[PDB]
Amino acid sequence: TQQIVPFIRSLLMPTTGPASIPDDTLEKHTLRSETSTYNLTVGDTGSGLIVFFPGFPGSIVGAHYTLQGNGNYKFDQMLLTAQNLPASYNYCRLVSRSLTVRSSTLPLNGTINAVTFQGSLSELTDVSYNGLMSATANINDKIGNVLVGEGVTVLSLPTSYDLGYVRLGDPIPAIGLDPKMVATCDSSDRPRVYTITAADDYQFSSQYQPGGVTITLFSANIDAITSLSVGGELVFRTSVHGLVLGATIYLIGFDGTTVITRAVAANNGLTTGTDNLMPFNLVIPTNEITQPITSIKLEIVTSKSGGQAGDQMSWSARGSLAVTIHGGNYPGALRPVTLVAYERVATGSVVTVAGVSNFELIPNPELAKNLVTEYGRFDPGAMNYTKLILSERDRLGIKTVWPTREYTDFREYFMEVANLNSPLKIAG
Amino acid sequence: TQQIVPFIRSLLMPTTGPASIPDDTLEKHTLRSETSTYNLTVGDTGSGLIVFFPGFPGSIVGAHYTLQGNGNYKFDQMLLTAQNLPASYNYCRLVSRSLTVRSSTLPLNGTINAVTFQGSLSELTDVSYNGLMSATANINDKIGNVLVGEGVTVLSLPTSYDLGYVRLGDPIPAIGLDPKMVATCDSSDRPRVYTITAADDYQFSSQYQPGGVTITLFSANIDAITSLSVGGELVFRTSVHGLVLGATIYLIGFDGTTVITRAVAANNGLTTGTDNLMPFNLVIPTNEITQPITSIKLEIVTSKSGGQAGDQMSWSARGSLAVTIHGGNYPGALRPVTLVAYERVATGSVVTVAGVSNFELIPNPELAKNLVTEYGRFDPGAMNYTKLILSERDRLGIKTVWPTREYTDFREYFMEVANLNSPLKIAG
Amino acid sequence: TQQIVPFIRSLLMPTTGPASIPDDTLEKHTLRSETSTYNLTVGDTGSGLIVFFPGFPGSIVGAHYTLQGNGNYKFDQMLLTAQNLPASYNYCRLVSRSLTVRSSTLPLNGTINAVTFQGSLSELTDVSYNGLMSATANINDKIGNVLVGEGVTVLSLPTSYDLGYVRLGDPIPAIGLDPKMVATCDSSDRPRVYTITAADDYQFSSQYQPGGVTITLFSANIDAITSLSVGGELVFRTSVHGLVLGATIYLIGFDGTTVITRAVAANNGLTTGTDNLMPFNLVIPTNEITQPITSIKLEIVTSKSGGQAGDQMSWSARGSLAVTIHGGNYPGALRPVTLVAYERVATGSVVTVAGVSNFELIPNPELAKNLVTEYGRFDPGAMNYTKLILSERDRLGIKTVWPTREYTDFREYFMEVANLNSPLKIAG
Amino acid sequence: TQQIVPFIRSLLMPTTGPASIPDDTLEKHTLRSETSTYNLTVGDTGSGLIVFFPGFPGSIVGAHYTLQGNGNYKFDQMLLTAQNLPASYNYCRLVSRSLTVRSSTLPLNGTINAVTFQGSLSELTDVSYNGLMSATANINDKIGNVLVGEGVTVLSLPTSYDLGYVRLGDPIPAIGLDPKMVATCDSSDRPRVYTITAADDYQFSSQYQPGGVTITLFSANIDAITSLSVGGELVFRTSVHGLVLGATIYLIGFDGTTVITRAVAANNGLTTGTDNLMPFNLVIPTNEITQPITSIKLEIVTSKSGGQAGDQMSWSARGSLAVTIHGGNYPGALRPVTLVAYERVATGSVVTVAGVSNFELIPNPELAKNLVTEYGRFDPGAMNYTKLILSERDRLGIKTVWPTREYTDFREYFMEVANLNSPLKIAG
């Protein structure tokens, strides 16, 4: 270590400030840091879960959920950046990030368990306080029973560099008749695609009922935080006359609550001996998503025009759907997820979250008039040193989740050289 | 500088020839240079605007517009590469590019203003001769009142390396009944997505009128040069019987002229107390786009079957659309835009554009039979030197827009070493 | 670092003592340190805001405000220096200053957010606990959710050196008939001037009403802590006979409460078809200002001598005013403002403020008889070292707001050399 | 010269970019460059005059005047900065500036004469094409008969460093009833004060006349570009009954046209054997000043209520006025003035002005949320080198007005070292 490599200093200690990433991605950008401060309130059970998205290239930092008496979680609020980046910048890239979770007030207060899972939120098999501990085999990606008073620090380690600049959900110039009109240029690069074969000649059969018979064709776990779109088509075949179908797609949250409900086809009559097409042309905007989506399901209501006591309704469906979450496969947008769970904490106490997030940004047309952009500072060996450090990650003890006390000791063990400036003022 | 780094020589002086990009993107390719020569004719006002796409990975170099008496611009023609690359190659990657704009004939002739904006064409706030000067805060990305006789040189600096190979709009083998059938494999990687929430329970209300009442629901600025597609769905609710809707999407150009007009739904009757779906399944091919698209708008016509004097027509719309321009977020396809504006130039004089564009290409199946491809020439320190140069960009005076005189002086200040060949013929 | 530079030691650790500023401002002065100790009491909401003026060249250190249930702040008291400097010195200059804010008693107690804004108090866009965090883009000028028990330290970094000596509001020898007569020589150098064009042929129109019709012509945000003066003139034109005007200027505080109310013109009759002048010759002394002024507004009352039911009163005003706060533009008198906000703190607990302020002073005629003054100690490289330090401010982590724990670690990391005295007693 | 001193590079070649000033004025600021582009049109006489304010700490760069057939000049327009600085920043400081004036179009075209006067505009004794040449004794501050086709370059040399930050005429938050209300915090530091003793017992005497007898009491040359205020008081004594006075202050421009007219006292009756006070409480805002003010005069109209053929009106005036132009004495706000005069140029041809202005700025509250500020880059010997250069100014040929050809040769003779970067990429 000669002095200190700006990037490494930033990667390991985000609270220090931003630094350009030493990869081959050469863009004229600007560096900024955004703080995240939140004072969460503990529920009745005294247990909760904070879902962090350490690699998210934007202002969405995470989401808080409180555990309830019945065992289910309840969405509280989204953890964001001090200010909304998309309102001022168009393109973004994540450099480093660290967050600390600890208790600050009391009405001494429980413990914390945390892990860094290498997958999206819905892919987790167990999200219970104790279950987390087995989300990864990596020992430096998990930490157990840390006193809340002490706190836990979440460090964001990379999941591949040389990633392109992600476009934020910035508002694009537009005018409309509707006051609630929203037009944005969303994160598209590197989209994730879920392919659900809802039915392959599925035989439906049930007796008549006033109001209709409702069934849930399928229910799969998908993940989404920002805009997504659903495409595909289901074909229905029938022998019975006068059958009317009703289809609705539900986007469910982590807490099991319905986040978004869209009617795919309401009041659709079926013709006998012919293919009845039911297209899916859903486009869900970012502002409509109030909390991370965890699963998607489709309900189909079958009703008859006439109807008696026992008419036996029946149809055959065949078709596949394609759920496409824009920019979903971009490393960090959904991929790495760090969970910080706490329990036994006093009811009514405050759990404080404080962090810093560093980005490489490109201002929007208006701000670009006064914001100067430049190419990254050049310093060879920065990337090599980073690769070296990451290579010896386990033997250096560089964790993704740390007990704040240990992280503070790491901040002084490391960064031992801050030698002001050698004879430059006495140089001549 | 040991002799000269092939890449740096190419980056700073594109007119010299092509060179492989020293990033981690290892593909067997071939290097070619394509010239661009145009003799534009000056309008009545003597003022015009040339929109350049310096980082475009293809044969589209820019577009020329002439300013008219009423103050609006008028599309002239597209500035392209000597020959159409997609006709001979499938994949492409941009290396370097430089273009010069100066007057050559006269019926002494005005000045030029130019800037390099870090965003797409429609994102610009001011496109007037004098307004440009404030598009960027960067001093080396703007240049003012340069004599047209002298000329201005546009240099293309990078906006991130390690970019994948873009697929050109190459024609794909296909046969059809229609003679005007076009089948191509377009630029898809890194798509840009605009999400427009056209209405959220928007209440429409107006009296009957023979022919119908037309309204413009919304109008947003989007950008597109190559193929794009529009998806989404609008849901209409009504209480009045016998209402018929007509919807049309218009893709407007920079000059305000309609480039592409597509009817989304013509003659669509509305049912009372039910959700009336109006799907959007538009796919606009590249050849249909005659000039850069700047904005998109949707018009809805409401007509009644019966009709009297005062029937009061009314409906409620709710829905979001998703405009997806293929390969839009790929750095250079739409992102950097350099504008060269000129004024006070004599009417009828010739404004000459001359440039060279260097690419890394992959031939199509037919040409690949005689075109040999190889991996880039290896020379360590090429990328590092590039990063160094770009790092000290401002203190070196490396501009994106130069006064030709200053650029020529830069070509000799730099590239001082062209030492033929040291004792190689006398080596042994 | 050779031993330690007296100035740098003082700048970075004000609690150490005073040191002369190494600029070109050579005056015979004396160095003194003044402590500031306060035990603020927390309100019902448990949230408050402390406004600091780190660069103030005098005994005014800041002001405390408590947040109330309705959301508005309420002035508590002014934070001052142990003793009133103007009572003993005439001229002053600020060297360094540090203050610490932390809880000391409890009836464990909330958190703190702080930032250093580069502008006066009224220029702030958001003064809420969470809003502060976005007052600056600079990461070392903000700090979030720091435990109150731990505390936050406010360090005063320079805003330009080579500033002249400011004259304190010292009492000047004078005798009068009034016992409440106050005569002082205020801070004048570098005055700030606000130019408010209240009206440009503004048309007033309203019906008669017993008592008069009152309207607020304008309301602008201005800043003032010490004496200010208001000048200018408004011209009124009218067609209606017997109109009487009443004008009053109000100087509003940060908490929205009226601090100073001055009647500009009471009972002023208007003449038809002639220019009616309404001069502004207001001079507000320092002792009349009980708390920082945030905005200034002008109310005009229009009443008629006769009066009926509907007489329609009307006049036309045209004129500009000039608010001049003496010594307002002197760096530090109003410019830098550091806000320390706290919340979730127990009601009734004590928030302790402790700091030290170092000055370069010039005694008044009486004290100058026993106070010896000398020119600054000469030591070359002091200013250069300061510039070096300030230059590498971000990479050294020199903040304006620190979490007391981190500031204490900084006090030992730095100032590592306090080598008593090398062989001077054994020299000979 | 080791490489090149950032400041010196900026001072001598402003078109290169901004650099922090190496004085003792340590403020956290940001550096920006603002272009100035104008295409002036030549008058009928083919002669004109461009008045430049090289040291102006703001967006006002100069003013253009055309010479007319009768010999008087006629204001054309103000030469400003690309964008209005006060709209985005609050405080400013000038670093360097250069402007070039040359012809670009023709319907070969005359010559140019230029000089740099060490005083404000109105203090010039001769402003004719040939008269300028004698404005200074300094040979490097004047240049004669330079071909317009070639051009003249205006370089801004310093007039004292260690100047404080000037506050721009930024709009301050305020609300009013009048739509044309303007509230700003103007440049106050370092005000200029003109003291005019209009009369010392001046005896007036003239016969009656219907309408009144108008006389011009005095007319003095003063200078102002931004807001100013007029104070003072005139006392009138008389023996004749029923005398009515009318007073009006006129602020005249460079072209002799009235810029601002304010009625001081209209319809004022005089009482016999008593002191009749006529106060001056004028405050002229910046937006009301359409062109530089050159002189101020006061007209007094004396009319009688009765009136006959020969009543002989008479009064005695005694009093002094104080014209105070805010921030007038700040070096550069009014002080140095460079005049560029041209003649014999073809009528209808274009005279192009192009320049760059570098500043040290402090963003307003809103912009400060995303604009990062830092202390100047530290590099000892920068100021010393500057003093050295300025010391040998005459023997180095560093002019304030240059023949563009000679300035270009100076740009290459100097700045010979732009050695990219010595073994830093090969360092290790």
JSON list of N, CA and C in Angstrom, two decimals, chain B residues 217-263:
[
{"chain": "B", "resi": 217, "resn": "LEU", "atom": "N", "xyz": [-54.18, 12.58, -25.67]},
{"chain": "B", "resi": 217, "resn": "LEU", "atom": "CA", "xyz": [-54.02, 12.11, -24.31]},
{"chain": "B", "resi": 217, "resn": "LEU", "atom": "C", "xyz": [-52.70, 12.51, -23.67]},
{"chain": "B", "resi": 218, "resn": "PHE", "atom": "N", "xyz": [-51.61, 12.29, -24.39]},
{"chain": "B", "resi": 218, "resn": "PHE", "atom": "CA", "xyz": [-50.29, 12.63, -23.86]},
{"chain": "B", "resi": 218, "resn": "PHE", "atom": "C", "xyz": [-49.29, 12.80, -24.99]},
{"chain": "B", "resi": 219, "resn": "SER", "atom": "N", "xyz": [-48.14, 13.37, -24.64]},
{"chain": "B", "resi": 219, "resn": "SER", "atom": "CA", "xyz": [-47.08, 13.62, -25.59]},
{"chain": "B", "resi": 219, "resn": "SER", "atom": "C", "xyz": [-45.75, 13.66, -24.83]},
{"chain": "B", "resi": 220, "resn": "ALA", "atom": "N", "xyz": [-44.94, 12.61, -24.98]},
{"chain": "B", "resi": 220, "resn": "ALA", "atom": "CA", "xyz": [-43.66, 12.57, -24.29]},
{"chain": "B", "resi": 220, "resn": "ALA", "atom": "C", "xyz": [-42.49, 12.51, -25.26]},
{"chain": "B", "resi": 221, "resn": "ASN", "atom": "N", "xyz": [-41.34, 13.01, -24.83]},
{"chain": "B", "resi": 221, "resn": "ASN", "atom": "CA", "xyz": [-40.15, 12.98, -25.67]},
{"chain": "B", "resi": 221, "resn": "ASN", "atom": "C", "xyz": [-39.41, 11.68, -25.48]},
{"chain": "B", "resi": 222, "resn": "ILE", "atom": "N", "xyz": [-39.17, 11.00, -26.59]},
{"chain": "B", "resi": 222, "resn": "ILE", "atom": "CA", "xyz": [-38.45, 9.75, -26.56]},
{"chain": "B", "resi": 222, "resn": "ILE", "atom": "C", "xyz": [-37.48, 9.88, -27.72]},
{"chain": "B", "resi": 223, "resn": "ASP", "atom": "N", "xyz": [-36.52, 8.97, -27.79]},
{"chain": "B", "resi": 223, "resn": "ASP", "atom": "CA", "xyz": [-35.54, 9.02, -28.87]},
{"chain": "B", "resi": 223, "resn": "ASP", "atom": "C", "xyz": [-35.45, 7.67, -29.55]},
{"chain": "B", "resi": 224, "resn": "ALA", "atom": "N", "xyz": [-35.29, 7.70, -30.87]},
{"chain": "B", "resi": 224, "resn": "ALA", "atom": "CA", "xyz": [-35.16, 6.48, -31.62]},
{"chain": "B", "resi": 224, "resn": "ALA", "atom": "C", "xyz": [-34.62, 6.79, -33.00]},
{"chain": "B", "resi": 225, "resn": "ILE", "atom": "N", "xyz": [-33.75, 5.90, -33.47]},
{"chain": "B", "resi": 225, "resn": "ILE", "atom": "CA", "xyz": [-33.13, 6.05, -34.78]},
{"chain": "B", "resi": 225, "resn": "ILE", "atom": "C", "xyz": [-33.39, 4.76, -35.54]},
{"chain": "B", "resi": 226, "resn": "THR", "atom": "N", "xyz": [-33.32, 3.66, -34.80]},
{"chain": "B", "resi": 226, "resn": "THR", "atom": "CA", "xyz": [-33.53, 2.33, -35.33]},
{"chain": "B", "resi": 226, "resn": "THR", "atom": "C", "xyz": [-34.84, 1.79, -34.76]},
{"chain": "B", "resi": 227, "resn": "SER", "atom": "N", "xyz": [-35.20, 0.57, -35.16]},
{"chain": "B", "resi": 227, "resn": "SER", "atom": "CA", "xyz": [-36.43, -0.08, -34.71]},
{"chain": "B", "resi": 227, "resn": "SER", "atom": "C", "xyz": [-36.75, 0.06, -33.22]},
{"chain": "B", "resi": 228, "resn": "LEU", "atom": "N", "xyz": [-38.04, 0.11, -32.92]},
{"chain": "B", "resi": 228, "resn": "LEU", "atom": "CA", "xyz": [-38.55, 0.23, -31.55]},
{"chain": "B", "resi": 228, "resn": "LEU", "atom": "C", "xyz": [-39.90, -0.49, -31.53]},
{"chain": "B", "resi": 229, "resn": "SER", "atom": "N", "xyz": [-40.43, -0.73, -30.34]},
{"chain": "B", "resi": 229, "resn": "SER", "atom": "CA", "xyz": [-41.72, -1.38, -30.21]},
{"chain": "B", "resi": 229, "resn": "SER", "atom": "C", "xyz": [-42.49, -0.76, -29.05]},
{"chain": "B", "resi": 230, "resn": "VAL", "atom": "N", "xyz": [-43.81, -0.68, -29.20]},
{"chain": "B", "resi": 230, "resn": "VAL", "atom": "CA", "xyz": [-44.67, -0.10, -28.17]},
{"chain": "B", "resi": 230, "resn": "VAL", "atom": "C", "xyz": [-45.63, -1.13, -27.62]},
{"chain": "B", "resi": 231, "resn": "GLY", "atom": "N", "xyz": [-45.62, -1.28, -26.30]},
{"chain": "B", "resi": 231, "resn": "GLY", "atom": "CA", "xyz": [-46.49, -2.23, -25.64]},
{"chain": "B", "resi": 231, "resn": "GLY", "atom": "C", "xyz": [-47.27, -1.58, -24.53]},
{"chain": "B", "resi": 232, "resn": "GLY", "atom": "N", "xyz": [-48.19, -2.33, -23.96]},
{"chain": "B", "resi": 232, "resn": "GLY", "atom": "CA", "xyz": [-49.01, -1.78, -22.89]},
{"chain": "B", "resi": 232, "resn": "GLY", "atom": "C", "xyz": [-50.48, -1.94, -23.19]},
{"chain": "B", "resi": 233, "resn": "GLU", "atom": "N", "xyz": [-51.30, -1.32, -22.35]},
{"chain": "B", "resi": 233, "resn": "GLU", "atom": "CA", "xyz": [-52.74, -1.44, -22.51]},
{"chain": "B", "resi": 233, "resn": "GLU", "atom": "C", "xyz": [-53.50, -0.39, -21.72]},
{"chain": "B", "resi": 234, "resn": "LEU", "atom": "N", "xyz": [-54.50, 0.18, -22.38]},
{"chain": "B", "resi": 234, "resn": "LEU", "atom": "CA", "xyz": [-55.37, 1.19, -21.78]},
{"chain": "B", "resi": 234, "resn": "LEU", "atom": "C", "xyz": [-56.76, 0.61, -21.56]},
{"chain": "B", "resi": 235, "resn": "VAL", "atom": "N", "xyz": [-57.29, 0.80, -20.35]},
{"chain": "B", "resi": 235, "resn": "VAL", "atom": "CA", "xyz": [-58.62, 0.30, -20.03]},
{"chain": "B", "resi": 235, "resn": "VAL", "atom": "C", "xyz": [-59.65, 1.43, -19.97]},
{"chain": "B", "resi": 236, "resn": "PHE", "atom": "N", "xyz": [-60.72, 1.30, -20.75]},
{"chain": "B", "resi": 236, "resn": "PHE", "atom": "CA", "xyz": [-61.77, 2.30, -20.78]},
{"chain": "B", "resi": 236, "resn": "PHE", "atom": "C", "xyz": [-63.06, 1.86, -20.10]},
{"chain": "B", "resi": 237, "resn": "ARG", "atom": "N", "xyz": [-63.65, 2.77, -19.32]},
{"chain": "B", "resi": 237, "resn": "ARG", "atom": "CA", "xyz": [-64.90, 2.53, -18.61]},
{"chain": "B", "resi": 237, "resn": "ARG", "atom": "C", "xyz": [-65.89, 3.62, -19.02]},
{"chain": "B", "resi": 238, "resn": "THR", "atom": "N", "xyz": [-67.16, 3.25, -19.16]},
{"chain": "B", "resi": 238, "resn": "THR", "atom": "CA", "xyz": [-68.17, 4.22, -19.56]},
{"chain": "B", "resi": 238, "resn": "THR", "atom": "C", "xyz": [-69.57, 3.88, -19.07]},
{"chain": "B", "resi": 239, "resn": "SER", "atom": "N", "xyz": [-70.43, 4.90, -19.07]},
{"chain": "B", "resi": 239, "resn": "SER", "atom": "CA", "xyz": [-71.82, 4.76, -18.64]},
{"chain": "B", "resi": 239, "resn": "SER", "atom": "C", "xyz": [-72.76, 5.00, -19.82]},
{"chain": "B", "resi": 240, "resn": "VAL", "atom": "N", "xyz": [-72.25, 5.72, -20.81]},
{"chain": "B", "resi": 240, "resn": "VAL", "atom": "CA", "xyz": [-73.01, 6.05, -22.02]},
{"chain": "B", "resi": 240, "resn": "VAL", "atom": "C", "xyz": [-72.95, 4.91, -23.02]},
{"chain": "B", "resi": 241, "resn": "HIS", "atom": "N", "xyz": [-74.08, 4.63, -23.66]},
{"chain": "B", "resi": 241, "resn": "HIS", "atom": "CA", "xyz": [-74.16, 3.56, -24.64]},
{"chain": "B", "resi": 241, "resn": "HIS", "atom": "C", "xyz": [-73.78, 4.02, -26.03]},
{"chain": "B", "resi": 242, "resn": "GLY", "atom": "N", "xyz": [-73.30, 3.07, -26.83]},
{"chain": "B", "resi": 242, "resn": "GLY", "atom": "CA", "xyz": [-72.93, 3.34, -28.20]},
{"chain": "B", "resi": 242, "resn": "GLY", "atom": "C", "xyz": [-71.77, 4.29, -28.47]},
{"chain": "B", "resi": 243, "resn": "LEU", "atom": "N", "xyz": [-70.71, 4.18, -27.69]},
{"chain": "B", "resi": 243, "resn": "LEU", "atom": "CA", "xyz": [-69.54, 5.03, -27.90]},
{"chain": "B", "resi": 243, "resn": "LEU", "atom": "C", "xyz": [-68.51, 4.23, -28.68]},
{"chain": "B", "resi": 244, "resn": "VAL", "atom": "N", "xyz": [-67.91, 4.88, -29.68]},
{"chain": "B", "resi": 244, "resn": "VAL", "atom": "CA", "xyz": [-66.89, 4.25, -30.51]},
{"chain": "B", "resi": 244, "resn": "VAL", "atom": "C", "xyz": [-65.58, 5.04, -30.43]},
{"chain": "B", "resi": 245, "resn": "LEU", "atom": "N", "xyz": [-64.49, 4.33, -30.14]},
{"chain": "B", "resi": 245, "resn": "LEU", "atom": "CA", "xyz": [-63.18, 4.96, -30.01]},
{"chain": "B", "resi": 245, "resn": "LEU", "atom": "C", "xyz": [-62.22, 4.70, -31.17]},
{"chain": "B", "resi": 246, "resn": "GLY", "atom": "N", "xyz": [-61.35, 5.68, -31.40]},
{"chain": "B", "resi": 246, "resn": "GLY", "atom": "CA", "xyz": [-60.35, 5.60, -32.44]},
{"chain": "B", "resi": 246, "resn": "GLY", "atom": "C", "xyz": [-59.03, 6.08, -31.85]},
{"chain": "B", "resi": 247, "resn": "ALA", "atom": "N", "xyz": [-58.00, 5.23, -31.90]},
{"chain": "B", "resi": 247, "resn": "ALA", "atom": "CA", "xyz": [-56.71, 5.61, -31.35]},
{"chain": "B", "resi": 247, "resn": "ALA", "atom": "C", "xyz": [-55.58, 5.50, -32.36]},
{"chain": "B", "resi": 248, "resn": "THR", "atom": "N", "xyz": [-54.71, 6.50, -32.34]},
{"chain": "B", "resi": 248, "resn": "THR", "atom": "CA", "xyz": [-53.58, 6.55, -33.25]},
{"chain": "B", "resi": 248, "resn": "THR", "atom": "C", "xyz": [-52.33, 7.06, -32.54]},
{"chain": "B", "resi": 249, "resn": "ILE", "atom": "N", "xyz": [-51.22, 6.35, -32.74]},
{"chain": "B", "resi": 249, "resn": "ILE", "atom": "CA", "xyz": [-49.94, 6.74, -32.14]},
{"chain": "B", "resi": 249, "resn": "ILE", "atom": "C", "xyz": [-49.11, 7.46, -33.19]},
{"chain": "B", "resi": 250, "resn": "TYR", "atom": "N", "xyz": [-48.58, 8.62, -32.84]},
{"chain": "B", "resi": 250, "resn": "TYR", "atom": "CA", "xyz": [-47.74, 9.34, -33.78]},
{"chain": "B", "resi": 250, "resn": "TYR", "atom": "C", "xyz": [-46.31, 9.44, -33.25]},
{"chain": "B", "resi": 251, "resn": "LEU", "atom": "N", "xyz": [-45.35, 9.17, -34.12]},
{"chain": "B", "resi": 251, "resn": "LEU", "atom": "CA", "xyz": [-43.93, 9.27, -33.79]},
{"chain": "B", "resi": 251, "resn": "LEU", "atom": "C", "xyz": [-43.43, 10.51, -34.51]},
{"chain": "B", "resi": 252, "resn": "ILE", "atom": "N", "xyz": [-43.18, 11.55, -33.74]},
{"chain": "B", "resi": 252, "resn": "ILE", "atom": "CA", "xyz": [-42.74, 12.81, -34.30]},
{"chain": "B", "resi": 252, "resn": "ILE", "atom": "C", "xyz": [-41.23, 12.99, -34.38]},
{"chain": "B", "resi": 253, "resn": "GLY", "atom": "N", "xyz": [-40.80, 13.68, -35.44]},
{"chain": "B", "resi": 253, "resn": "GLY", "atom": "CA", "xyz": [-39.39, 13.93, -35.66]},
{"chain": "B", "resi": 253, "resn": "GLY", "atom": "C", "xyz": [-38.87, 15.16, -34.95]},
{"chain": "B", "resi": 254, "resn": "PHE", "atom": "N", "xyz": [-37.60, 15.47, -35.19]},
{"chain": "B", "resi": 254, "resn": "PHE", "atom": "CA", "xyz": [-36.97, 16.63, -34.58]},
{"chain": "B", "resi": 254, "resn": "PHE", "atom": "C", "xyz": [-37.57, 17.91, -35.14]},
{"chain": "B", "resi": 255, "resn": "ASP", "atom": "N", "xyz": [-37.90, 17.89, -36.42]},
{"chain": "B", "resi": 255, "resn": "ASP", "atom": "CA", "xyz": [-38.47, 19.05, -37.09]},
{"chain": "B", "resi": 255, "resn": "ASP", "atom": "C", "xyz": [-39.97, 19.22, -36.83]},
{"chain": "B", "resi": 256, "resn": "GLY", "atom": "N", "xyz": [-40.52, 18.37, -35.97]},
{"chain": "B", "resi": 256, "resn": "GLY", "atom": "CA", "xyz": [-41.94, 18.46, -35.64]},
{"chain": "B", "resi": 256, "resn": "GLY", "atom": "C", "xyz": [-42.88, 17.78, -36.63]},
{"chain": "B", "resi": 257, "resn": "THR", "atom": "N", "xyz": [-42.31, 17.23, -37.69]},
{"chain": "B", "resi": 257, "resn": "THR", "atom": "CA", "xyz": [-43.10, 16.55, -38.71]},
{"chain": "B", "resi": 257, "resn": "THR", "atom": "C", "xyz": [-43.37, 15.12, -38.28]},
{"chain": "B", "resi": 258, "resn": "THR", "atom": "N", "xyz": [-44.53, 14.59, -38.66]},
{"chain": "B", "resi": 258, "resn": "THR", "atom": "CA", "xyz": [-44.89, 13.22, -38.31]},
{"chain": "B", "resi": 258, "resn": "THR", "atom": "C", "xyz": [-44.04, 12.26, -39.14]},
{"chain": "B", "resi": 259, "resn": "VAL", "atom": "N", "xyz": [-43.31, 11.39, -38.46]},
{"chain": "B", "resi": 259, "resn": "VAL", "atom": "CA", "xyz": [-42.47, 10.42, -39.15]},
{"chain": "B", "resi": 259, "resn": "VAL", "atom": "C", "xyz": [-43.21, 9.12, -39.38]},
{"chain": "B", "resi": 260, "resn": "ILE", "atom": "N", "xyz": [-43.90, 8.67, -38.34]},
{"chain": "B", "resi": 260, "resn": "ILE", "atom": "CA", "xyz": [-44.63, 7.42, -38.41]},
{"chain": "B", "resi": 260, "resn": "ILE", "atom": "C", "xyz": [-45.96, 7.53, -37.69]},
{"chain": "B", "resi": 261, "resn": "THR", "atom": "N", "xyz": [-47.00, 7.11, -38.40]},
{"chain": "B", "resi": 261, "resn": "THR", "atom": "CA", "xyz": [-48.35, 7.14, -37.87]},
{"chain": "B", "resi": 261, "resn": "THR", "atom": "C", "xyz": [-48.94, 5.73, -37.90]},
{"chain": "B", "resi": 262, "resn": "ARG", "atom": "N", "xyz": [-49.31, 5.22, -36.72]},
{"chain": "B", "resi": 262, "resn": "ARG", "atom": "CA", "xyz": [-49.91, 3.89, -36.61]},
{"chain": "B", "resi": 262, "resn": "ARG", "atom": "C", "xyz": [-51.24, 3.92, -35.86]},
{"chain": "B", "resi": 263, "resn": "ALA", "atom": "N", "xyz": [-52.26, 3.34, -36.47]},
{"chain": "B", "resi": 263, "resn": "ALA", "atom": "CA", "xyz": [-53.58, 3.28, -35.85]},
{"chain": "B", "resi": 263, "resn": "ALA", "atom": "C", "xyz": [-53.58, 2.12, -34.87]}
]
